[PDB]
Structure 1
Amino acid sequence: SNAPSLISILQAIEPEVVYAGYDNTQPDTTNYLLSSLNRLAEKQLVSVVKWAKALPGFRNLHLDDQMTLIQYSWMGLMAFAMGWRSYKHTNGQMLYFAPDLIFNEQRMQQSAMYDLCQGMQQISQEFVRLQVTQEEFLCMKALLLLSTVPKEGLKSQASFDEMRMNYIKELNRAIAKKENNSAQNWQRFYQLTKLLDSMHDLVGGLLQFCFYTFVQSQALSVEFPEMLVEIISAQLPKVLAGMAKPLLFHK
């Protein structure tokens, strides 16, 4: 309580932005865009793992819970942070994958996943509409890691549930700082948690494309780096068996 707030810790451990290493002089083509996003995903994946290990409460989970949460959440976390970066850097008009890999209309079209790009942009436009604050975002991003679990339950169910309640309490703390009335805070919590819930449907779409391009990678000439291959190969069978379920705030 005089302890450093959870928010101050989340601010301290928030990763720095990852560069794609993209050559912007190349023409916009499907396999160079998709292979480059996968190379970016590989670098963001090490960032995410490092961030997750520092997240207060996370290391108290069983190691199999930790790995499972990561497998189930990586796409959503990266998609959610992209919504944030697109909001802060382009007011939701473009997809800010990295400072050196920004998608405009032409690149979204050449990516072969135009509709999904639009999905991702709609998330960014909801950040813009709510004017999400940095403190809200960081709490929401933690909660997103804790929002897809095994149907069978986790090995550390009590520790997980306590951790989830602590991050929800911190999101409400971040909201109440603006010093609005209580009813306004309720509304804000509702809007932010709707935004979180809306990630699940987007992610399902993103997963469908990713899994397809993964299975067809040779024929499409779309490169998947080693760690991405590992996490997709692990996740794909569990999703197929329907082992994961979303934890929704709203029915």
Structure 2
Amino acid sequence: TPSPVMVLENIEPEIVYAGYDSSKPDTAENLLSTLNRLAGKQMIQVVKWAKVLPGFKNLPLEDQITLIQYSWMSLLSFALSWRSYKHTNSQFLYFAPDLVFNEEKMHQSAMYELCQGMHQISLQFVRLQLTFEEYTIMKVLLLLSTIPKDGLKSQAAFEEMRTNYIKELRKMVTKCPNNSGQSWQRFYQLTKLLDSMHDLVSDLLEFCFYTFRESHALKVEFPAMLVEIISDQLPKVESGNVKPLYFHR
């Protein structure tokens, strides 16, 4: 009886804490190591979420794993923007209740410009007054936004799921009385915003791949969950096996 949207609300991961330790200095190494542990905890939640996401179990298991590994940074970034919007009206980057970045933290992390790019997305949520239902559907479209260039196991199952979620977003936006007279314009602003995530996420991934490769030299710690994702994904990236999907490019 519940709609896919109702299911998406039910399965949305609860907000987690970073374990930020106020007895340690805010060096880039400490901040990045803390963020990496946070992201590891969030990614374990993303895997559990994906297991009960409507339609996802109908893709081959290998494709489910691939899509998580090809989208993880987009999923985390998009959820970060939502939390920042909801809990601070996009004044800060709300990584977790115990890890909230102002401009000082953005500098201390050694990721100022990357954080500024993310902050711009959260500001677009304010401009749009993005709704929770739009957010939940768009997050699934991000899961389905980047594919191997040499093929998923089932193209057909992937295209069916992606088409279904695009239709969910289009129907929701165009049928909502809050959007009357402007609903197609809003739909295209939302799809343009999804496309803009690829630029930002590529940049975030490049820096993360760097500190991963140089982890021991740079003293930037990564939890096993991220080591699993990055060890599987980085060779595919280096080989050129990544195809971002765009609505308008």
TM-score, length basis structure 1: 0.96
AA in 1 matched with 2:28: T
Query: What's the offset of the Cα at 1:53?
Result: 1.1
Distance (Å, rounded) in 2 between the aligned partners of 1:234 and 1:202 = 21
Distance (Å, rounded) in 2 between the aligned partners of 1:59 and 1:110 = 41
Contact (CA 8 Å) 2:179, 2:186: kept in 1 or not? no
2:203 pairs with 205, 211, 222, which one? 205
Distance 1:88 1:247, change over 3 A: same
Distance (Å, rounded) in 2 between the aligned partners of 1:181 and 1:44 = 33
Cα deviation 1:168-223 (Å, max 9, x = unaligned): 11112321343156651100100001110011010110011101101111111111
Query: What's the offset of the Cα at 1:27?
Result: 2.8
1:63 pairs with 53, 58, 61, which one? 61
Task: Specify the alignment match of 2:30 in structure 1.
Answer: 32
1:81 paired with 2:79, answer: yes
Distance 1:20 1:180, change over 3 A: closer
Distance (Å, rounded) in 2 between the aligned partners of 1:231 and 1:169 = 30
1:161 pairs with 156, 159, 162, which one? 159
Distance (Å, rounded) in 2 between the aligned partners of 1:183 and 1:159 = 34
AA in 2 matched with 1:207: L
Query: What's the offset of the Cα at 1:227?
Result: 1.6
1:20 pairs with 18, 21, 28, which one? 18
1:7 paired with 2:2, answer: no
Distance (Å, rounded) in 1 between the aligned partners of 2:171 and 2:99 = 35
Uncovered stretches (5+) of structure 2, i.e. residues with no partner: none
Distance (Å, rounded) in 2 between the aligned partners of 1:10 and 1:79 = 18
Distance (Å, rounded) in 2 between the aligned partners of 1:133 and 1:64 = 32
Distance (Å, rounded) in 1 between the aligned partners of 2:50 and 2:17 = 20
Distance (Å, rounded) in 1 between the aligned partners of 2:124 and 2:179 = 23
Task: Specify the alignment match of 1:187 in structure 2.
Answer: 185
Contact (CA 8 Å) 1:197, 1:249: kept in 2 or not? yes
AA in 1 matched with 2:50: A
TM-score, length basis structure 2: 0.96
Distance (Å, rounded) in 1 between the aligned partners of 2:128 and 2:84 = 14
Query: What's the offset of the Cα at 1:24?
Result: 3.1
Question: RMSD of the alignment, in Å?
Answer: 1.3
Uncovered stretches (5+) of structure 1, i.e. residues with no partner: none
Query: What's the offset of the Cα at 1:18?
Result: 1.3
